[PDB]
Design a binder for this molecule. Sequence first.
Ligand SMILES: [Zn+2]
Ligand SMILES: [Zn+2]
Length: 81
Amino acid sequence: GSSGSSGKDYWGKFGEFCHGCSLLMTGPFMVAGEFKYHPECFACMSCKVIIEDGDAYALVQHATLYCGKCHNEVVSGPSSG
Ligand SMILES: [Zn+2]
Ligand SMILES: [Zn+2]
């Protein structure tokens, strides 16, 4: 298996860039977890489903993001354990 891709400016930090790609944005964006992302890059870490402006996202105590349906396992609220 192979991978290895780069291109992330160190300099030029005035505008806003999707945290996930470091590329500059111009149109609409989403804000959560005190970060910034392209409207196409705010997704459940594990499953990759794109979250939209209203779909229930979930945050973790660490740099991670999940969907409300699946973060359900990390909380176990109405379950036994
Ligand atoms: Zn992006
Ligand atoms: Zn999910």
